[PDB]
């Protein structure tokens with residue numbers, strides 16, 4: 001729906017339901033600025049936008065080296081359901097360096113909200129974070145406003161000059177509420193269940209981040225559930241065309257317990273070239289080649305030479321949920337791999 005919510009620095013630390021009223025806190029802020037603002041703004045004008053040049057730093061070896069984000073980039077995260085997803089999302093909030101985090105949970109169960117709120121309660125970031133949510137027992141309309149409230153909230157801190165990270169968990173549940181609305185209103189399913197309206201409403205939502213000439217950015221990570229194929233779920237093909245790339249979490253890698261379960265084969269930052277230097281571009285392309293050739297101890301046979309590179313590769317890609325690496329560390333460690 002078309003609507004107004006609360007924004008401001010008073011909301012830092014807050015949990016916000018799909019109306020706009022705080023229902024819990026993971027932190028207490030000393031500021032109490034609380035303006036009332038529209039939930040459905042338009043994207044910035046092409047004349048208002050900065051170019052994407054400086055990286056968004058996550059702290060996660062495998063994205064900061066091979067899928068570097070740009071401040072103001074809009075990134076997909078494609079994952080089947082589970083922890084994998086929320087393991088990666090917890091790290092982005094932990095080991096990135098954004099000024100503010102706005103997190104929008106859509107359509108999950110109540111336990112899934114509580115888990116995020118407990119995560120937040122134990123994050124040093126907790127004072128820089130806002131959480132909007134809509135569980136599955138709320139209505140289609142309310143699930144769509146969660147997305148809008150959370151963007152709306154991220155938008156305020158952007159005109160106040162902050163570098164903002166935005167997370168929408170399940171775009172595919174945004175979009176499904178979006179359609180149950182359109183079908184309630186009485187509209188004809190075009191594409192595979194979905195009124196043509198939802199796919200013209202999508203660019204408007206997704207182009208409201210990121211970076212502005214006046215200073216202010218919203219880098220936006222957006223989740224997409226993988227349940228069936230590009231024929232059966234139209235979203236993935238559409239979301240792919242509108243966003244600036246995508247991290248693919250792998251079931252195969254997860255089912256072996258490689259975490260984070262990122263298939264760099266299937267992932268791309270579309271702003272890579274323009275946010276990392278030519279040093280990087282090369283070393284990164286190196287490593288990908290390496291990965292390709294590993295496909296082709298235990299413990300004393302001179303096969304040893306194999307196992308010890310698999311194990312620096314596997315050691316580089318794996319990361320402990322508590323550890324953030326900075327550019328240098330990441331870049332050093334990747335150098336130490338291809339020599």
Ligand SMILES: [Mg+2]
Nearest residue numbers: 001141144181
């Ligand atoms: Mg609506």
Ligand SMILES: [Mg+2]
Nearest residue numbers: 055056057097
């Ligand atoms: Mg950064």
Ligand SMILES: [Mg+2]
Nearest residue numbers: 061062317319
């Ligand atoms: Mg890593």
Ligand SMILES: [Mg+2]
Nearest residue numbers: 056058068069
């Ligand atoms: Mg990055």
Ligand SMILES: [Mg+2]
Nearest residue numbers: 079080249251
């Ligand atoms: Mg998956």
Ligand SMILES: [Mg+2]
Nearest residue numbers: 081082083084
């Ligand atoms: Mg999983």
Ligand SMILES: [Mg+2]
Nearest residue numbers: 081082084085
């Ligand atoms: Mg998952």
Ligand SMILES: [Mg+2]
Nearest residue numbers: 087090091321
């Ligand atoms: Mg984690």
Ligand SMILES: [Mg+2]
Nearest residue numbers: 086087090321
């Ligand atoms: Mg975690």
Ligand SMILES: [Mg+2]
Nearest residue numbers: 077088089221
């Ligand atoms: Mg995420």
Ligand SMILES: [Mg+2]
Nearest residue numbers: 155156158159
């Ligand atoms: Mg803004």
Ligand SMILES: [Mg+2]
Nearest residue numbers: 151205206208
């Ligand atoms: Mg948005």
Ligand SMILES: [Mg+2]
Nearest residue numbers: 164217218219
């Ligand atoms: Mg940003």
Ligand SMILES: [Mg+2]
Nearest residue numbers: 172225233235
């Ligand atoms: Mg989907």
Ligand SMILES: [Mg+2]
Nearest residue numbers: 230234236237
């Ligand atoms: Mg598709």
Ligand SMILES: [Mg+2]
Nearest residue numbers: 206207242243
């Ligand atoms: Mg776009």
